Amino acid sequence: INPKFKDLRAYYTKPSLEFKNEIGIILKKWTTIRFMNVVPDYFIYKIALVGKDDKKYGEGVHRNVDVFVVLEENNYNLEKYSVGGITKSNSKKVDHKAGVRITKEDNKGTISHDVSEFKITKEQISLKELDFKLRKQLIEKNNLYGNVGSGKIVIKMKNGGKYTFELHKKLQENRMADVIDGTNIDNIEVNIK
């Protein structure tokens, strides 16, 4: 485990929480960004509204919301804070899978291959969740951010289109708020260099 990747490895090995079929509460702005409050247990989670989420959710109550949460440190003196990951709750049952192909190349030049399948149980999924779950898998199973920490994850959609997450840096915050049709994910290709 190499220190120039220690930040990336620490972030992508955090615990995540998934809150489904919840209610979101947006209070009046009190700092430079707005938050959606979610209360699934005895804690109040503040979810930053970044990217498209700002114009998407007005002040007030928002029902049928699902959130993929990763507690992070912040400059707003908030205890339970997470960015993006908000999706609309399911309209119906979803039971879809996407095949994952991994190729890894060492600093030695050693090349490995691996495969898995990524289960999808949500009609609408955030890039935050795809990005986060996959990297965590890559770290735990393929030693991502140990020996090497660059490359890409590419989610391919059934219609043709692609979303690519560059491994050398965290997923951009504005992108943690983008959302896609889970049912339209075809397969996932990962190249670790």
Task: Report the interface residues with Cl ion, using CB under 5 A.
Answer: 27, 35, 41-42, 90
Both structure tokens of 28: 């009046």
Give min distance, CB of 138 to Cl ion, in A: 27
Q: Which helix (DSSP H) or strand (DSSP E) does residue 54 occupy?
A: helix 53-56
Give the residue ranges of DSSP H helices in 79-145.
127-142
Q: Shortest distance, CB of residue 105 to Cl ion, whole angstroms?
A: 39
Q: Which is nearer to Cl ion, 90 or 183 (CB)?
A: 90
Q: Looking at beta carbons only, is 79 or 106 nearer to Cl ion?
A: 79
What order do you get walking across the sheet with 111-120 strand by strand?
Answer: 111-120, 96-105, 185-192, 151-157, 162-166
Q: How far is the CB of 104 from Cl ion (least distance, A)?
A: 34
CA distances from 92 to 7, 30, 96, 124, 163 (A): 38, 37, 12, 11, 25
Nearest CB to Cl ion, comparing residues 27 and 61: 27
19 CB-near residues (< 8 Å, 6+ apart): 38, 40, 45, 66, 67, 69
Q: Which is nearer to Cl ion, 103 or 121 (CB)?
A: 121
CB of 132 to Cl ion, least distance (A): 21
> Minimum distance between the CB of residue 21 and Cl ion, rounded to whole angstroms?
8
Nearest approach, Cβ of residue 141 and Cl ion (Å): 28
CB nearer to Cl ion: pick between 59 and 117: 59
**Which residue, judged by CB position, is nearest to Cl ion in the bound state?**
41
Candidates 115, 50, 122, 123; CA nearest to 81 is 50
Between residues 8 and 47, which has the closer beta carbon with respect to Cl ion? 47
Q: Which residue is it, tokens 């397969």?
A: 187
